[PDB]
Design a binder for this molecule. Structure first.
Ligand SMILES: CCCCCCCC/C=C/CCCCCCCC(=O)O[C@H](COC(=O)CCCCCCCCCCC)COP(=O)(O)OCCN
Ligand SMILES: CCCCCCCC/C=C/CCCCCCCC(=O)O[C@H](COC(=O)CCCCCCCCCCC)COP(=O)(O)OCCN
Ligand SMILES: CCCCCCCC/C=C\CCCCCCCC(=O)O[C@H](COC(=O)CCCCCCCCCCC)COP(=O)(O)OCCN
Ligand SMILES: CCCCCCCC/C=C\CCCCCCCC(=O)O[C@H](COC(=O)CCCCCCCCCCC)COP(=O)(O)OCCN
Ligand SMILES: Nc1ncnc2c1ncn2[C@@H]1O[C@H](COP(=O)(O)OP(=O)(O)NP(=O)(O)O)[C@@H](O)[C@H]1O
Ligand SMILES: Nc1ncnc2c1ncn2[C@@H]1O[C@H](COP(=O)(O)OP(=O)(O)NP(=O)(O)O)[C@@H](O)[C@H]1O
Ligand SMILES: [Mg+2]
Ligand SMILES: [Mg+2]
Lengths: 585, 585
């Protein structure tokens, strides 16, 4: 409940502070009128209690005027309440916008290991629940918590100042018992609430992880297994929610029992005071109406805001997302890459592990030169795409250096380094919109003719002619509404559009036939000058990297061989020779 | 609001019907006591209005008893309210469990084209919002809509039967104006509500489609573009929510103005009646308290249930999910596949298109024989995986037949057909749990030794030894926390575990090196007898399908060539010959 106060009452921006102060003033005045209306009611009561000696007499003007004042005060209370609602809505919605956008920006700033460890549906669910929790927390703390507190305070003061100290003792002992009971009961309901939250999260995790792999669910006939798992989670959530609802019923019943005992004790004290010729029926009316219109709001907002602590939990998960750690960040004095030169990557005694318990790279050292086409090869699980994610600075090594033109990539603006490097990754999840905006995701600021020409160079024009909604065909969930080769070609088109200098191709020809593959590689190596771009091909089809100027063979996270094609093929004891042997026959 | 009544009041299961009837009875009695308490208040008032001639007199017993009855009726009202809450909670949670499970089952029953066209995050968001909407709709329709309606009815009746017909006219004209105003105002707020819903859905779609492709977002430096898109959606949602909150404030203010005019008119009528020696101050107290304790609940539940129509929209989207169409369903008299025989697929003049405007297969006809290893090849976008999804009966063709052992696959139980067919798909999205339960997803009812031996046959033992948490390593979001070859090998292991008869391999060696590839194919073709399984390899590395007994070459959705390796290679004019030529040099 602190960060929220930092968003609704921030440093600077006196506009929102003035808005909050006006909301507070309207709240105050609303409660003042809601507490003053019963005095007008008492006045009209005690003024009508006289003996009228003529049934035809017209209503005196004083009583008409005080009834008018009663109605006007009731209306004014509700009116100020609603104006407060409006103003603080204008405030809370700005707060929610701000926090949602900041959280999105951060999520975009975080590292990869933090996103892969977590399920995206979980992040979106947390964000939605947290925005709704902010909304409910505010809608409750400025409509039905602070106002009822102010009203309780002024009611205690009135009943202590106008009807003696007895009523004061009654009210204070009542507040004491109310607090004790609510405390000892929330300490016992929190358990069921926690269980229900856990079970709901588990059930949603199951549903999501199942719908994502719907194919891999039907392919193996495990619908019933997952449905029974979901049903178990749901049956735990059901029992927990039932128990918390029963406990909340018990809570509210006991609260209202305490309050009603207080109310009847107040009626009895006022009645034995009227007996003593001190008070009057007007006083009983006043006391009972004060306490009753203070009570029924309390009971109803307590039984209605049955979900407010869960809202705090959601909001806190959201703020935790917003306050995680950014492992990859610019230095204090970040440089910027050269202007017009070919780039040269260099791994110097690097050693990296996605987790501290395993080392994927064991003292790797090599040189990806400038203007040349190098090709990385090796066994699977050997640390090829790991290099590709180090240079792009998704992770940073634990020991060693990554140099570009002789400067560690930590001395560079990450956003300036990630703008000269263009990657065709292994997995190519696209968007759920047209082919147009997915090919135009490389250079948003691109003229459509460039999109068209790179599409023609990525061997995509035939597909675009066959499809009847060419350049508008929706490609469904992460690209599943098209082929696997077409996704590779869309990614290659994105990369040709970025028009970068260092081009990584992590198996961009694994789903393409030999014809399309060779045509595409020819179109690529013939698009750029012979000394401009620095290309790195992660290849398992060693026939596509035969024209490479430097082949980097690595195994078990260590560079074993380095050299051109024939220098390795015509050399005994070479792993590349064994791979080419098994590839030839 | 009809399907909900079908879940809370179903055919059979008299238990839930009796529970609902008891909840209704408790609601009735609660409102009865809440309407009777003011009569006790009036009695004590009019009994204390006498002139006491001794300040020391003790309180008579009748007045003490009627005050006791007043407090007891207040407590009983709240108590019955809370018991009703508990009971109907036990009912509504069962309803929610039932609907969630049925919706999940259906989603699992629907076809693929329905899942690919939609984003899974959207489905999970709809389900969550719909469950919360069911909860809120019930919590509002049995706590603060039906009860207030019954109370309004009995209040109208009382004020019509006990204080003449004037009060009746006042109350009925008040209800008329209230209704007219609320109608003409909701007709004007629905627009802002719709706009806000649209914008929230758009913003969430953006956030999701961006977090899923976080890699493809950072790889191209389009964080700011997506953040500005999100901010635009959020700034539309902000203005719309602001406008609906202001409009709701105006609504509630006008409602309470009408109600307060009614209240003051009632006070004036009662006062001019007291003038006429007919009524008494007790009557004014009674009227005003009835109307006031009927009012403040109404106003507060109206300003609190600001989100109830959106809940209906969510619940209706959920029920629509639950009432979509199942294109793929068993026949009326479904057969079951033979017991112990090799299966033989046969496409007979088939013609299929994922959408009615394009035909991926143009009169395809061929025969995947039994006990043999056939291999499908052809250009990309040519309709290979389409076959693989037809046989598995994800879609059904528009013209033609798919035969297994001479019987159309429509005359078979889909769940019996999908249990003899094991697929290694192109895209292999795994789960977010250990390698163990992802290799044990083929045959859940498998002894761990089989898991271990298939893992050893899928060339995964080395990885399992290297990892320090072997067989427990979490594989992150859809398998991104491991290699791309390791995912292929996990899928091949799943398939070897299913121990099926018809094995489809849609490019299961695209990320594996030649060494692992040949070792794995050898381990596979040597695991089963030479005439048991029927294998279909979708291959782009034509060196892995040279030992095939039948190669099916298709282009532009039509089978062009069919025959063994050399029969096509040593034949001029063959597409397979051109592919092998481009693959050799
Ligand atoms: C989390 C937030 C917590 C904050 C807590 C702060 C609140 C502290 C409590 C305040 C004590 C107020 C006690 C009021 C004493 C006055 C009682 C009284 O008789 O006043 C009434 C009604 O006035 C009325 O209508 C009285 C209404 C109250 C008057 C001022 C309220 C205080 C405003 C403070 C602004 C922040 C006047 O009617 P009469 O019968 O003519 O009284 C004759 C006596 N002069
Ligand atoms: C979406 C749902 C819509 C459903 C609508 C149905 C409701 C229809 C409305 C009902 C009209 C009720 C009219 C009540 C007339 C009785 C008024 C009255 O004077 O009764 C009071 C209080 O009783 C009381 O406490 C009166 C309380 C009401 C008595 C019965 C209520 C009806 C129960 C129906 C059950 C379904 C008795 O106090 P006294 O001063 O002693 O009265 C002396 C006269 N005998
Ligand atoms: C707490 C104080 C309770 C002890 C009783 C105080 C008390 O009796 O003094 C009140 C006014 O004081 C007061 O006005 C005390 C006002 C109480 C302070 C408001 C409570 C704020 C926090 C509530 C939580 C006057 O009482 P009496 O002497 O009987 O006067 C009767 C008519 N003048
Ligand atoms: C609607 C009917 C309103 C016209 C007025 C009916 C009326 O005045 O009759 C009421 C009782 O009727 C009644 O009790 C009518 C009860 C009203 C029916 C309850 C309303 C149910 C639907 C509410 C929506 C008795 O009125 P009076 O003759 O003045 O008797 C005074 C004391 N006996
Ligand atoms: N839901 C879909 N809606 C429309 N078209 C689709 C859909 N799914 C696949 N396609 C298209 O239908 C054509 C053939 O699809 P597909 O059967 O996957 O080819 P493929 O043989 O798998 N190519 P590849 O896997 O790369 O070797 C292509 O034009 C696809 O883009
Ligand atoms: N988030 C991760 N956490 C732990 N291990 C990982 C993670 N990501 C990748 N790995 C592991 O690190 C090792 C090398 O990963 P990787 O760099 O992707 O190999 P690769 O060269 O891409 N193989 P392939 O793409 O199939 O040719 C493998 O054992 C992976 O399983
Ligand atoms: Mg890789
Ligand atoms: Mg395919």
């Amino acid at each position: 409940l602190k960060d929220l106060f930092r968003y609704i009452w921030p440093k600077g921006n006196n506009k929102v502070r003035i808005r909050v102060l006006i909301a507070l003033g309207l709240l105050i005045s609303a409660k003042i009128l809601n507490v003053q209306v019963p005095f007008f009611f008492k006045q009209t009561i005690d003024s009508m209690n006289i003996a009228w000696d003529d049934p035809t007499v017209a209503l005196p003007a004083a009583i008409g005027l005080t009834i008018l004042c009663y109605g006007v005060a009731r209306f004014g209370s509700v009116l100020f309440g609603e104006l407060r609602n409006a103003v603080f809505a204008k405030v809370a919605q700005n707060a929610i916008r701000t926090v949602s956008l900041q959280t999105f920006q951060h999520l975009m700033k975080l590292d990869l290991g933090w996103h892969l460890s977590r399920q995206t549906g979980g992040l979106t669910r947390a964000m939605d629940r947290g925005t709704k929790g902010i909304s409910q927390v505010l809608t409750a703390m400025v409509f039905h918590i602070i106002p009822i507190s102010f009203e309780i305070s002024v009611v205690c003061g009135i009943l202590t100042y106008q009807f003696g100290a007895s009523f004061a003792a009654i009210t204070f002992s009542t507040m004491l018992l109310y607090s004790i009971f609510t405390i000892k009961t929330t300490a016992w309901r929190t358990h069921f609430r926690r269980d229900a939250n856990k079970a709901d999260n588990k059930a949603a995790s199951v549903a999501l992880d199942s719908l994502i792999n719907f194919e891999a669910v039907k392919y193996f006939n495990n619908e019933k297994y997952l449905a029974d798992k979901y049903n178990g989670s749901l049956m735990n959530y059901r029992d927990s929610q039932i128990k918390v609802s029963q406990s909340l019923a018990f809570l509210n019943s006991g609260q209202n029992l305490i309050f009603t005992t207080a109310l009847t004790a107040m009626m009895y004290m006022g009645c034995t005071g009227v007996i003593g010729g001190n008070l009057t029926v007007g006083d009983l009316v006043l006391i009972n109406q004060l306490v009753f219109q203070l009570s029924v709001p309390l009971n109803f907002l307590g039984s209605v805001y049955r979900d407010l602590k869960q809202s705090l939990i959601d909001m806190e998960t959201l703020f935790k997302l917003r306050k995680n750690e950014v492992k990859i960040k610019n230095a204090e004095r970040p440089l910027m890459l050269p202007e017009n030169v070919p780039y040269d990557i260099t791994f110097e005694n690097v050693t990296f592990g996605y987790h501290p318990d395993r080392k994927i790279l064991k003292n790797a050292s090599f040189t990806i030169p400038a203007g040349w086409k190098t090709a990385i090869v090796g066994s699977s699980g050997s640390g090829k795409s790991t290099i590709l994610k180090l240079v792009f600075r998704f992770y940073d090594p634990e020991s060693g250096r990554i140099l570009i033109n002789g400067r560690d990539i930590k001395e560079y603006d990450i956003d300036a380094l990630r703008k000269v490097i263009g990657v065709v990754p292994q997995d190519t999840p696209l968007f759920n919109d047209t082919i147009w905006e997915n090919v135009k995701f490389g250079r948003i600021d691109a003229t459509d003719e460039e999109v068209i020409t790179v599409v023609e160079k990525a061997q995509l024009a035939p597909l675009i002619k066959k499809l009847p909604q060419g350049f508008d065909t929706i490609v469904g969930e992460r690209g599943l509404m098209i082929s696997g080769g077409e996704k590779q070609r869309l990614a290659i088109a994105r990369v040709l559009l970025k028009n970068a200098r260092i081009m990584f191709f992590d198996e961009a020809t694994s789903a393409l036939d030999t014809h399309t593959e060779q045509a595409l590689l020819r179109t690529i190596r013939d698009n750029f000058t012979s000394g401009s771009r620095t290309s790195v091909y992660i290849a398992h089809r060693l026939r596509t990297i035969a024209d490479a100027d430097k082949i980097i063979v690595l195994d078990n996270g260590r560079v074993r061989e380095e050299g051109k094609h024939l220098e390795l093929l015509a050399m005994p004891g070479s792993l590349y020779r064994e791979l080419w042997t098994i590839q030839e026959d």
